[PDB]
């Protein structure tokens, strides 16, 4: 017959981009079809909309050619159960990689056939019309209800809608379901198929509300609203129907309008007879932001002239205007200044399944970084997503599913007229979902298509349709005519990348060019792939400079996280640039300018310290009271003057004293740390009665104080060992080091089949610098009146040619002291090391690491804004960074003291220390094939290069954090407890 | 089978606004597939492109489930031949008429099926790829060859092409065509069914030319051109094959390019490799307009590095630049002024099948008349209409096929985003075909859909795709955001129409509102139904005033003319109010102003002739020689200065001596009269000897002169015959007359079921005008010293109201001549009357009528610019307008002397004479049911109302030319010969 799937499976309808749907509903705001005002004024479930997420079966098969007929009417023998909301990809049928004819798929195409035996009950079959709601399929899918074909539906990322009051019976019904892994949406979604979303039935009234929308108007100051619903019915017109339209503050009715349908003349032919806009005027609204999230409730019921109620729908709205004026984006008349993040909904073990708690637990640790806006990440999200950054307060964009970055010409499709209407189907349907939510702030036209006349087009659909929010739209060079914002994607600060007929100017650039008027917002930044986000802070200053420069979206939250929402180091870098206090230091005077654009800092406590060396002499604590871009001046109580040799440190930071919907009570919010006076050491040593003995064969050079020992390699010129008492100290001998394990920002795109050779990496390894050689040149070997004075000289060479030349000296006193001075020269015309360092492997493993020095967390030259200068102790798991790829780790900046075990050295280095050499983490691929090594691997650097992070494709370590001085010195004094 | 009826019509794609085609083929510029560059440069006919047109097989269906499975395979035993280009209502099959559910369209949809056996040759099998193309399928259709399926089609007036080549085989193939009279497209074509349009088969090699598109750019002063011509191609891309595009003036070439395939770089991903940029410098080129079209050869081919032609196709190519500037619509920099005409495609007789000698007639007319620009009416016309209108040269307004005026909201189709692909498909397509003609200077996104959301997509789209044509649209308000250019539809010169949310203002009025800074270009104005076109010199006396008033397009050129392209009399006013010269009369100077943009007036040379009462006495013939708007000053010879009585008349005339490609040795394009001086007659009528004898009854009033009587009833008061030696004169007595037979402007949209009141004849109807009933009040008669004096007074009265009162004397001297003075009152309450004047019906008929008046064509006083004072005699069947529904028609006005047999009447005023009295005017529906009757009916008024024709559906008659005086006055010498 036409259900069989010979007759279905004919015309190839996931082969045709002018088929994107068969017998789909249309788009509307989600409804709960309430049947009693005061649940849909609570939010209570309704008794309407029934889940059907459980347990489906399902069977996987090679091709759509390869179904049997006798699924459309039994489930198949063989048939696996599983849980519809999900990707048959976790469930091993098919391989899902991360990874050519536009309208044509590959015929071997995967298909999953789901299927549900459920009950509908004689009262949704009586009267009315029941839908089913697919919020997501992946791909394309065709659909049968008790044998008989329903419809097709495409466009993954949007819900699809079908009508089953004819298909279905009383009692069992089963839903067939086919899921094709590719069809020609594909081309606009460039896998893990599946109905990775929930499944639902609705059921409606004969007559029914079938679409509403609201607005927000104000008047100059905001003091007075009016909030305009337009109501939509559907089904047959009687002149008793009313519709009222109520909003509710709390439990306190604040706003309400009835009317009959019939809407205003629109043009010659009259006006619409089943449509009513009303207006509801609201004094004094509570106005939404992402500061303080104020929410109304709007309830919309159908009823009739005498009272009783047809059906009831209901939305959250705020009150808040947004706007692009003389080049500012204004959310209520402020310059909004966006703290974003990228963001895909990836569940930590479900694949693209994203439940309620997963969202909440993101949304409170974006809250607690101090992000303040959301992009939805090439795609529109969950419904739900929507609702609690309504609540919470997070600026959204929201993106239409266009993607075609993999075409050649890259608006091959996106310049065709052809493809038109696929495109214009999943921006259509977006704004159409997701238009009443105040939390979406932008709409975005997609990502990585390049820029044709659909761009333009679709662009002009939405300002028409919806000119409350303005439209972005990265694609052809990020400042076309379809875009109100310029949106790049990873442009720099000072730096332009001129690509052809699409460069990327520096941002400070880009804004001036002429004729340019727009903001400037990036859609993506900060590329945080590893070890990564150097240069952030950069970012942030050209923010708070620059007035059209309004932010940006950090790439990838889930990333800023690992998959376990584990925090990233660099993380605490963003809280700290992206935080809304900012500090200046006059004297003994505090100027605190708040960032706040509408809220009073109502729960802010500042609290202050004073420590010299990590040792803690004065602290204080002082309420905050800020007006929103206001400042308060705070003067410090007399600091303390000690006469000690050390250097003064003040650390302020901001405490919330109260727990927030997203915060628990002493959360930190901002903080800053300044130097405040420097007493230099005068004091000299006490000169020591013994001094050390030294003794030298042609092996080694051995020097002898009390218990302690040094041995000396003649031959390589390192020291080779240690002893205290009998134990040797050493596993490793002391030598320097100028590589380190190549970051993800290292290695760039560079590959094994497909080099890039301008990689920090490749230039690294075509120089020679891992594969160099030390060879000995001098060694000297003295005693003089109080010490023993070691002299060593090294040259490292390649090819023929010397990259860097060390020379050492080691002073040991009669204290057991043994003070090494490193001067290293570099050849101007080899690439600029990784670092300058030493480093050697202790043999002892000890429980914890002591140091003065910067932050308790990773950070590096060009990532330390956010560590602070103190007295850390930590267990020594906490000094390695488990990034996924192995690389070079755990490093801390502006050390003077470090302590671990019996051992100490002073000066002023950054170092790491862990169980794993720079080797192994250079030569693992995966972090879970590591394994911890006989000692400790210690690596002291005088100088440390950047980590880079604007991109991960091209070198992005600033010139400022490259080791291009040519000469470098450095000392440390190594000593033991004594 | 997949093929069969049951499975094909299963889904029902004529019900679905999603589904518009399948498997159809890119819209693309008309291809020939050229094989010899020599061919395709002289536009010889093809071998590639075989005609399919001729005798078909056709059946009738009442509904398309009415098909038999037989018809897939052999062609049904009663089917009947017909020729396929053609409707099939012009067959008698299923009833047309001129004259609900969005998607759904009735179930009893007729079905035509037809069939073709034609041979395939060999070679055309063996390689290369075969297409269909259907230029017009009115609807929506099925394919099928030799029995397989091939695709789908909508939009009836644009081409569907079809890839045939792997349903061909050797010899004979069957194609089966299976339209349907409704489809969802339908509702975008708010009839008469069938294969209108040609049917084609194209052959093209494997790699080919698939798109290509021409721009020109122009420097400041059009003296240097680049002609940049964009070529794509499909199929097996190689690195030898090469695009050559060469520019001809004739047969000499003025620029040629050569590249191999390959673009500059679009984004980031690289450019086309499958399409190349050609950039041609020309210099001065011979710029194309309506006055001057000249025209290139554009040929473009494929070919290998080598040398050898792949294939070669061509286009003409008008330098020309189109541009919005200030305001003004401007071609190659100067002002356009549209002198522009509606034209639906209709054959004379073959229903909307059009073939090459129409148009070519159709555009000869309209350039004759003073037409330079024509509107496609609402859908896009045959691809060789554009062609005529390059090589004649007429600007062209393109048209998509979108017209959804039933809607009730009027734009709930055009406002949804479900219809938004079907809309575009159709704008997008026709912008893909047509993009390549010079006569095409704008894109119009449709007619009468109101405004929605689509309207600002699609002409968004269009700016984006074609920035080198603006684009206009009706609808919303004829001024929104999706239109270039202020078209409205019917605005008035002085007179706003404020209808809500739609007002149709003043165009002078529309210019000025606040912010407005537009052109106005009407799109339609001056409806020519029926008797017709009055105030046109006032809609082109406000275009030549105003700057930004450029025009407009005169509704239904078919209409301004006949069926059988028989010129209506509006016509020549037309003619005359859109000539290229002005003229200016100072003293004995006649100043001549061109209204020529481009060219100087090298065929023009003016005749003048002097006059008295239309006897000539002076006339000379003078070269022009004006510049393009420029003037030239003509001083007259000494004009002669008669001393006997009468009224100077000055014709000057502009005469083409030589023939053109659209006008005949000797055609007169402008011309124009003025009143010299007047000889006021002072000479007395000699005294006469005989007095005429007067004889009184009780019945009547009897007055004898010689062989001459005259009879006035005495009962009724009026003149009831007249008596030429014992021949009786009259057979209908000389009665007063207050209405006419009413216009189409009269009656506008009142019908008998649903009245319209405001229409004048409904006034009139109401008035009583028609029913009112002359009673006589005073009836004197007298013997002065020479002549015989009747006086009579008689009221008209309705239900107890007196409307009009008319006193009348007569007075009969001895010469015969019997004088007429009629006074009449008119209530000022009752709606103002169509004419006061004298009517009879004359007992002789006779072969001629002259008249000393204006014109030689029918004039009215709202419509009479274009008639001349002269002497005119003319058959009495030229007195009579043959409107296809009667009306009054025929009038002369400004009429001194009119003599008719025996018969002269001498004053001022209007006359209309013919052989259908004004009673069978009014109750006659069709002009083929009039009948002559015995005698000549003669309507002589002394005052005549204005006939309107701003639209059709409202009263339109100037207040000026509304008889509304009150009181009225005029006098008439009735004498016969002697």
């Given at each position: 017959i036409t259900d069989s799937l010979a007759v279905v499976l004919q015309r190839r309808d996931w082969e045709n981009p002018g088929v994107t749907q068969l017998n789909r509903l249309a788009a509307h705001p989600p409804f709960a079809s309430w049947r009693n005002s005061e649940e849909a004024r609570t939010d209570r479930p309704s008794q309407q909309l029934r889940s059907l997420n459980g347990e489906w079966r399902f069977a996987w098969f090679?091709?759509?050619?390869?179904?049997?007929?006798?699924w459309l009417e039994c489930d198949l023998p063989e048939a696996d159960t599983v849980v519809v909301p999900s990707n048959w990809q976790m469930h091993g049928y098919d391989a899902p990689i991360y990874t050519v004819n536009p309208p044509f798929v590959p015929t071997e195409n995967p298909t999953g056939c789901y299927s549900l035996t459920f009950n509908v009950d004689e009262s949704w079959l009586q009267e009315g019309q029941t839908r089913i709601i697919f919020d997501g399929v992946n791909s394309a899918f065709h659909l049968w209800c008790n044998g008989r074909w329903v419809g097709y539906g495409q466009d993954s990322r949007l819900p699809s809608e079908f009508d089953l009051s004819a298909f279905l019976r009383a009692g069992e019904n089963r839903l067939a379901v086919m899921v094709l892994r590719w069809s020609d949406g594909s081309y606009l979604e460039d896998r893990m198929s599946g109905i990775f979303r929930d499944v639902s039935l609705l059921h409606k009234p004969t007559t029914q509300i079938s679409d509403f929308h609201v607005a927000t108007r104000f008047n100059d100051d905001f003091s007075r609203a009016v909030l305009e619903a337009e109501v939509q019915m559907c089904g047959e017109l009687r002149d008793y129907l009313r519709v009222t339209v109520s909003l509710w503050q709390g439990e306190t009715q604040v706003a309400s309008g009835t009317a009959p349908f019939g809407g205003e003349i629109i043009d010659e032919r009259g006006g619409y007879a089943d449509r009513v806009t009303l207006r509801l005027n609201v004094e004094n609204p509570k106005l939404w932001s992402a500061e303080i999230p104020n929410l109304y409730r709007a309830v919309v019921e159908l009823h009739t002239a005498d009272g009783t109620l047809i059906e009831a729908e209901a939305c959250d709205v705020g009150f808040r205007e947004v706007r692009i004026e003389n080049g500012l984006l204004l959310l209520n008349g402020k310059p909004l200044l966006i703290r974003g993040v990228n963001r895909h909904e990836?569940?930590?073990?479900?694949?693209?399944?994203?439940?309620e708690q997963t969202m909440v637990q993101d949304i409170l640790l974006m809250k607690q970084n101090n992000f303040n806006a959301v992009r939805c990440s090439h795609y529109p999200n969950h419904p739900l997503w929507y609702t609690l950054c309504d609540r919470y307060g997070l600026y959204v964009v929201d993106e239409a599913n266009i993607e075609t970055h993999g075409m050649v010409p890259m608006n091959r499709l996106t310049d065709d007229p052809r493809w038109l209407p696929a495109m214009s189907e999943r921006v259509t349907r977006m704004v159409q979902r997701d238009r009443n939510h105040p939390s979406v702030i932008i709409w975005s036209l997609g990502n990585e298509s390049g820029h044709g006349a659909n761009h333009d087009a679709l662009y002009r659909w939405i300002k028409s349709v919806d000119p409350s929010r303005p439209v972005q739209y990265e694609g052809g060079g990020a400042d076309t005519t379809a875009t109100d914002i310029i949106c790049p994607m990873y442009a720099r600060v000072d730096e332009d990348q001129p690509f052809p007929a699409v460069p990327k100017w520096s941002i400070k650039k880009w804004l001036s060019l002429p004729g340019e008027t727009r903001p400037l917002i990036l859609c993506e930044y900060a590329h945080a792939m590893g070890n990564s986000l150097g240069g952030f802070a950069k970012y942030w200053q050209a923010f708070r400079q620059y007035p059209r420069l309004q932010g940006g979206f950090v790439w990838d939250w889930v990333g800023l996280v690992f998959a376990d929402r584990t925090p990233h180091p660099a993380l605490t870098e963003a809280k700290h640039q992206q935080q809304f206090f900012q500090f200046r230091l006059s004297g003994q005077t505090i100027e605190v300018t708040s960032?706040?654009?509408?809220?009073?800092?109502?729960?802010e406590l500042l609290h202050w310290m004073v420590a010299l060396d990590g040792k803690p002499l004065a602290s204080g604590e002082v309420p905050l009271d800020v007006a929103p871009q206001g400042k308060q001046l705070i003067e410090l109580p007399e600091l303390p003057q000690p006469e000690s040799a050390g250097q003064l440190w003040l650390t302020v930071r901001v405490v919330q004293p109260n727990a927030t919907a997203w915060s628990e009570a002493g959360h930190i919010s901002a903080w800053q740390q300044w130097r405040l006076a420097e007493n230099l050491s005068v004091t000299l040593p006490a000169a020591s009665h013994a001094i050390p003995h030294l003794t030298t064969s042609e092996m080694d050079f051995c020097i002898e104080l009390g218990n302690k020992r040094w041995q000396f390699n003649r031959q390589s010129g390192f020291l080779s060992q240690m002893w205290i008492g009998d134990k040797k100290q050493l596993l490793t001998p002391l030598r320097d080091q100028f590589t380190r394990a190549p970051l993800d920002n290292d290695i760039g795109v560079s590959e094994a089949t497909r080099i890039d050779p301008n990689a920090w990496v490749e230039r690294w390894k075509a120089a020679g610098h891992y594969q160099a050689e030390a060879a000995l040149l001098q060694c000297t070997a003295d005693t003089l009146a109080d010490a023993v004075l070691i002299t060593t000289a090294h040259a490292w060479q390649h090819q023929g040619k010397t990259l860097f030349i060390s020379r050492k000296t080691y002073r040991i006193d009669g204290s057991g002291q043994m003070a090494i001075t490193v001067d290293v020269e570099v050849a101007?015309?080899?690439?600029?090391?990784?670092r300058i360092g030493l480093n050697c492997q202790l043999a002892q493993v000890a429980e914890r690491v002591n140091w003065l020095g910067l932050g308790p967390q990773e950070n590096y030259p060009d990532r330390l804004t956010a560590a602070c200068f103190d007295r850390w102790d930590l267990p020594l798991s906490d000094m390695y960074t488990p990034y996924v790829f192995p690389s070079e780790n755990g490093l801390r900046c502006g050390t003077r003291e470090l302590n671990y075990g019996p051992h100490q050295w002073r000066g002023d280095f950054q170092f790491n220390i862990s169980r794993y050499s720079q080797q192994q983490l250079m030569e693992?691929?995966?972090?879970?094939l590591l394994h911890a090594e006989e000692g400790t691997w210690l690596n002291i650097d005088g100088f440390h290069m950047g980590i880079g992070g604007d991109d991960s494709w091209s070198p992005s370590v600033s010139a400022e954090f490259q080791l291009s001085a040519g000469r470098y010195h450095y000392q440390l004094v190594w000593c033991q407890k004594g």
């Open positions: 090679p091709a759509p050619e390869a179904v049997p007929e006798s990836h569940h930590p073990l479900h694949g693209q399944v994203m439940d960032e706040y654009l509408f809220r009073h800092s109502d729960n101007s015309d080899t690439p600029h090391p990784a693992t691929s995966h972090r879970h």
